[PDB]
Ligand binder design. Sequence first.
Ligand code: ATP
Ligand code: ADP
Ligand code: MG
Ligand code: ZN
Ligand code: ZN
Lengths: 309, 609, 163
Amino acid sequence: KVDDVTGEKVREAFEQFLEDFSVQVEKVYRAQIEFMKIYDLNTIYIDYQHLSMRENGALAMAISEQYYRFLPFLQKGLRRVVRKYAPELLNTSERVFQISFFNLPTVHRIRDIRSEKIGSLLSISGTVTRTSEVRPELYKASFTCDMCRAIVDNVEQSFKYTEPTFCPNPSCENRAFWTLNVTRSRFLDWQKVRIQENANEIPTGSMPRTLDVILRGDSVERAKPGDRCKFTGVEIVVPDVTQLGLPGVKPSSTLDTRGISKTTEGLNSGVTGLRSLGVRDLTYKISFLACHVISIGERDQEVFLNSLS
Amino acid sequence: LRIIWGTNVSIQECTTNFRNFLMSFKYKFRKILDEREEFINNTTDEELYYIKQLNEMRELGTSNLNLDARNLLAYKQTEDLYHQLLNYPQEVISIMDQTIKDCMVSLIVDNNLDYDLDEIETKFYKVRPYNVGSCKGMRELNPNDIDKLINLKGLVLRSTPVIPDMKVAFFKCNVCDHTMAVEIDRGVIQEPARCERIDCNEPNSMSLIHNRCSFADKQVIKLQETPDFVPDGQTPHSISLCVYDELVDSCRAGDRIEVTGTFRSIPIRANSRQRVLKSLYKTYVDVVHVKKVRQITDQDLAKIREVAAREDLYSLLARSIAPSIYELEDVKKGILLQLFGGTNKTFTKGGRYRGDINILLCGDPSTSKSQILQYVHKITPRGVYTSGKGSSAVGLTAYITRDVDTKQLVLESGALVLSDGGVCCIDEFDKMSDSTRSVLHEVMEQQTISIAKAGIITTLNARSSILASANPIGSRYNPNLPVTENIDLPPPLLSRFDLVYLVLDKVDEKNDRELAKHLTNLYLEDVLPVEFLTMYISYAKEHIHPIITEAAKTELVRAYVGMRKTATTRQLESMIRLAEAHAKMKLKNVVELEDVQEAVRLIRSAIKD
Amino acid sequence: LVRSLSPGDIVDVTGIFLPAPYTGFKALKAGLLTETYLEAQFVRQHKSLTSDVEERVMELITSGDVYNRLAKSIAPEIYGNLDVKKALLLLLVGGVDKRVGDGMKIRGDINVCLMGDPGVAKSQLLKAICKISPRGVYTTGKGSSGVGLTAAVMKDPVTDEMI
Ligand SMILES: Nc1ncnc2c1ncn2[C@@H]1O[C@H](COP(=O)(O)OP(=O)(O)OP(=O)(O)O)[C@@H](O)[C@H]1O
Ligand SMILES: Nc1ncnc2c1ncn2[C@@H]1O[C@H](COP(=O)(O)OP(=O)(O)O)[C@@H](O)[C@H]1O
Ligand SMILES: [Mg+2]
Ligand SMILES: [Zn+2]
Ligand SMILES: [Zn+2]
């Protein structure tokens, strides 16, 4: 199978950064991993300024430009570091780990969002105006063949319900008709929040621009409506899954209650040709995926005496 | 020799004609072309207009051109391109960019300097032609000029967010994990058949990686036909505009713009599922140039200083703000002092202390207060002029409203929030409703507005200044009755205003004749800076912060005590603000006796009325 | 032949009367019912500075009594209210609109209000004045909202977008 060479260099560089930084010699990141081991946490925090001094930014800029393609190698290196220094954090009561970046040099507004930063690591600021429920998202799927009863596991899913194709270890031939084992599958927390532009960035006469920010994992409910929050994460693009052949008849080929814009009828450039689409046209829109959130806008004596210095 | 298929355009002659045009053209040929008499040839004939712009662009590094059509027609040999561009814009523009590619090299190596030219090689250039032809409205567009450059005019209604457009697809193999990029042509993606790797070579093993592709930016604009050209009993028409690359996010909503672009028509599908199309196309335009309808220089600083060195700066800008208004110099004094405002401070322990001046004008009903308010509206940088007669009870603050285009939620600020850091003018103060009045009460007391609706709890910032104008009950303000009965305003609301002026109109022969005289002289057809005030106001408001010295202490304490020989403590904090605002004028960095004397004189002349 | 017809015209149009296919959706319920349309081929509408109009004004000047006759000929059915007819003439013409420098503007338009008891020919006088000037609109009470209908939303059925 074809492998990457730059990804390997980033993976070893991240391991060296985690093992060697130690600048306060305190082993600050090893201190954090020990704190996670004792407190049973599932997310790590990496500062950009700390990384901004090793390799003269060669690693930092490489991570920033292509965060989307380098994240799998960063997690792979983190797994090896955890195994080497703290095996207890390798299994649960495996913990799906998360990496949280913060303290980026420059901040962006919502009106600086262009398609040429898709996949890059950015930080944005805005006022929250709507939040949704904490729904469970399917992370690692598990199925059973209807006839063989063979078990498949760890079937990655990107944006739609994806079942396996080629059957496991025997002679059995089967393209479909699987049964999700909802008990064995891994799930994660999911939340969608709507943000708009700040009162100062809004021009004299303007209808405010909006965006969809996705919070996942331990970052749920940390943004409340009406507050002013600074998000940081990766800028992604989300397709329309309805015309990507969803299994159920419930989608019913884009059932609608309101009338779409006639102005952008045929003006929105949709790509065709793919076999999954058929003769349909796939469309895209820009959304944000956030990994770290910050905000920029007990009468018991015994417990009280504990906190104070 | 060879010609691009379909058209008659050939690159060979076009490139040579364009280079001859650029190195040869001057204002000499332009003024020979137009030759409208009274045409200046004072050294302009040899200025080499194109080469100087080319060099200044090279040294700046920006890629923006303003090639005109009349200038392109000026040269005799390149006259062919004038009629060769109107009919085939795309290919001619492609030749345009290709020639500009080496227009850089033609000038960087004339003296053989050490410019890298590598960043020039990487970057690309384009052109923005304008004034292509006679401007015609959207109401006269036939199918006879599809794919031809036109110039349109219209009102901007709305804009859409940035739209991604795929350029380079990206396919990965689910077995051998091999990555290959496939370019797309006109939207259609030619699917890879089987993995190129001969060893892997598996049928139907392709997966599309959406977030590893390459995208470009699009924007769509909506225009409306201007009300002037529409005839009787008609409904305005609409046209959609396509904007790409650097021109995205240029046209604000509600503006009126004249654009240049290529007319185009595309088919739209009859059925969503089937391949079938219907025999009626949609028409739009792809735009290439858009036109509509801080950073002060050191010379501006010098002229500001020398003007500030004037003996009497007070009276000059007293008369400049309202040239039409005759007499009423005292209210203009107060407004001039208001437009600067005392210094603002927020220390940790005590908290923020206000630095805005509030002024209320009231009196007999046929004075000129509304014109005074509309005068101060323009001078101030950021401000809003809306009457208080009606509208929503929170119309000056945030109002959570349902979005019209999308069934979503939008938080829209009001007029007090939109006048943050400036002067907000309220007209018809007496008609403002009893329920909305309380809103202003929290604005003039804490300078913040809190909204708690639809699951949103938040606070905004007002920090503005209120200048208001009111009218009494009846046709006259009789002096015998006190202020309270006539103005129909709550005592606290009137009290919290920093300065209150009474405008009186008495039947005086001298005053009536003098007023009528200059009014008729204005109607008769036969020391006022234009924009110096705005820059001086910005300089004084954004850089200058005065302080207080004991010389102000000695006068202020004894003045307040002497006024207490029914002056509330509000009076002293009003004197301090006015004195510190006067100190910002006659540019200084500290207060002295003159400022406090002027402030007390103003606040006691206010008491006299 | 396109653009020969405009809204508000009484015309006599000739053409071919043809059946529309009515296909697509809602065609099944009709079955054998069809739409129809007329392919147009001819138009017959039922109903400047030149020496002619240069001489008309001279003729009217030589006629004399321009003021009184102009006021009087307005609505000859109604007898009396001659001063009102003089004032309606002044309203028909417009005063000077001079744009003074530094932002000052002065209006030349006329604001005339006519009060009085009911049943005095209140509402023929008005309607009659609307005939004289092409640019005029007769707006009435709360039956329809047109005086202040400077709305920014228009749910036009053709495209369902705002105008
Ligand atoms: N001076 C007049 N000359 C001719 N007819 C007149 C005169 N004054 C009133 N009329 C009559 O009055 C009528 C026209 O006015 P009308 O009473 O219909 O409306 P109005 O004055 O607006 O009153 P209302 O309040 O009832 O609507 C006609 O019957 C007309 O003959
Ligand atoms: N002192 C004055 N100088 C110049 N014009 C005046 C003066 N006083 C009254 N006017 C005239 O009277 C009119 C006043 O109208 P305005 O003050 O705007 O109405 P309101 O009483 O509703 O504020 C203006 O058209 C103006 O020309
Ligand atoms: Mg009537
Ligand atoms: Zn099987
Ligand atoms: Zn392969």
